[model samples]
Target chain A: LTCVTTKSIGGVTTEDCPAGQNVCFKRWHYVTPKNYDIIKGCAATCPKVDNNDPIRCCGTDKCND
Target chain B: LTCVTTKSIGGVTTEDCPAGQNVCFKRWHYVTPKNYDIIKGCAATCPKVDNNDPIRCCGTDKCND
Candidate 1:
C-alpha cells in the first residue's frame, strides 16, 4: 500500500531499485530543497513516480502506515 | 517539515486555523469521503494548496520518514 511501481528510463543502474520489478519510492517527512530535488529526479527517471506529490502519494493516507 | 500551515474561509469559530500560518491539513488514513472531504474543502478555501494528494503532503518523505 505504501509502495509505487517503478520503471527504468535509461540503462538500469543501482538506483534502478530492486531491479526488474517496479519499486515503491519511500516518502519523506517534509518538502525541502533536498527533498524536492529527490522527487523531481525520481519523477523524471522512474517509470511513474509514486507519491508524485507529498500529500497525495500515500493513496489513502498522506503519510505511510 | 511535517506541517502544511493553515488558513481561514467562512466565519470560523474553530476551523479557521492559525492566521497566515496556513495550518497543515493533517494527513489522512485513506482517501475516503472523510479524507478527501478535508482536502477538497481546505483546498477550496485555503489560500494555498497543500499535499493535494495523499502522497504529496509530507513533501520530503511520503510517510513522514
Candidate 2:
C-alpha cells in the first residue's frame, strides 16, 4: 500500500506503506503563526491522540480518511 | 519583543512580536520520515500540550529554550 504523504506548509508527497504498517498519519491545523500548515504521512503504529489538534491513524487505502 | 522565527527543513527567519504576544512557538522532531523537520515562530497564547512529540510555546528572549 501507499500513503499520500505531505509536508507542512506545502507539498503532495507520498510514501510506500510497508507490510504490517497499515496506518496513514494525518496531522492538520499544524498552523504556523502566519497561515494554517498541514502534514500527512505513514506510520507503523498510529496513536489515538486528543484535544483540538489531533493526529490520527486508521486502516484503509487512504488511512488518514 | 521579537521571535526567532524558523521554517521546517531549513532557515533562520525572524518575526517581530506585537504587544501581548510574548509566547514563542517551537515545534521539534516534526519528522518527515526522511529527516527531522523543525519549525518555530511566535504565538499569542501557548497551550500546555501533552504527548511524546510536543508543540511548545514559552516566554523570554529565546523562549523555545
Candidate 3:
C-alpha cells in the first residue's frame, strides 16, 4: 500500500502500507492548523469529513497526492 | 483506503481509511482477547507488532486478511 502527501504539511512525502493492502487514503485536518495532521493508510473507505477535516481514499497509484 | 478482514474477527469484514492516503493499517491486540480490537486506518507504515499482537499494513485489495 502507498500514500502521497504534501511537502509542507508535515514533511511527509510518501507513505507505505502493509504488504497486500489495496487502497490509498488521506485526510485534511483543517479544523485548526495547529490541530491538523495528514494521515494515510489501507482502508476500504475513506474517513468522513463530519464538519472537521475532510478525508479521501483511492485505489490507483499515486492518488494520494 | 480499502481493507479486508475475516468475518470472525470483530465483525470487521472490511474497513476504509482516509482518502488520498496510500497505505492500509491493521493491528492485533493479543494481550487478551478481551483487550483485542481490530483497527484499520491510514498510515505510511503498519502499526508495529512490537510483541503486541501483530500490526500489519498493505497496498493491495483483500490484503488485510
Candidate 4:
C-alpha cells in the first residue's frame, strides 16, 4: 500500500508500505506546553487510541493525507 | 461477533453483531453548548473519522469499552 507520511515539523511524503502493512494511520501526539505533534504512516494493524490521544486509520492509498 | 454497544445516555451493553459486522467502534459527537456525546457499536467497516469528530475501531470483543 502507498501511504502519506509526515511529521509535525516535516514536509509530507509518500511511502510504499512493506508487506503486511496495509493501512494508513494518522496520530496526534501531545507535546509539552499544550502543543500537539502529528505523524502519519503505514501500519499492519490500526489499534484504538486513547481518548486523550486521537488517531485514525484507513485502508486506501494515501489515506493518511 | 459480540461487541459492546452504548449511547451517551444509556448504560453499556453487549450486542451480537449481524453477519459481516466484525469490528467494534467508538465515536464522539460534538454537541451544542460545548458538550460531547459518545456512541459505540459494531460495524462492518470502520472508516476513518474527521479530525474534529474523533473515532476508533478495533477487532476484538468489547474493544470499544
Clashes of each: 35, 0, 44, 0
Regions of model 2 farther than 4 Å from truth:
A1-65, B7-10, B32-34, B47-51
Worst 10 residues of 3 chain A by lDDT: A4-13
Relative to the true structure, candidate 4 has a C-alpha RMSD (angstroms) of 12.5
- Per-residue error (Å), model 2, residue A58: 32
DockQ in order: 0.02, 0.02, 0.15, 0.02
The numbered model that scores best in TM-score is 4
lDDT of 4: 0.68
Error of 2 at B38 (Å): 1.2
- Which model, 1 or 2, shows the larger TM-score? 2
Interface RMSD of each: 16.2, 13.2, 7.2, 11.8
Please provide, for model 3 over A1-65, each residue's C-alpha lDDT reduced to its tens digit, 9 standing for 90 to 100. Answer: 56664432235566565556566767665536677566654444565556666667787766866
Residues B6-63, candidate 1: write the lDDT tens digits.
2245221223211111112333335565554233111111123364445322222112
Please report how far candidate 4 places residue B3 from its true position, in Å: 1.3
Q: Report candidate 1's fraction of native contacts.
A: 0.00
Once fitted onto the true fold, the runs of candidate 4 whose alpha carbons sit more than 4 angstroms away are: A1-65, B7-9
Question: In model 1, which runs have C-alpha deviations exceeding 4 angstroms?
Answer: A1-30, A36-51, A54-65, B1-10, B15-65
- Give the per-residue lDDT digits (tens) of candidate 1, residues A1-65: 22332111211112221223232233232455455312211222223324443422322211222
**Could you arrange the candidates by lDDT from highest to lowest?**
4, 3, 2, 1
Which residue pairs clash in candidate 2? none
- Candidate 1 predicts chain B with a TM-score of 0.19
**Chain A only TM-scores, each candidate in turn:** 0.18, 0.60, 0.53, 0.78
| lDDT by residue (tens digit), candidate 4, B5-58 | 994469888996653344578878777657787888976456446656777776
True contacts kept of each: 0.00, 0.00, 0.27, 0.00
Candidate 3 ranges with C-alpha deviation above 4 Å: A1-26, A30-33, A40-48, A54-65, B6-9, B15-22, B33-53
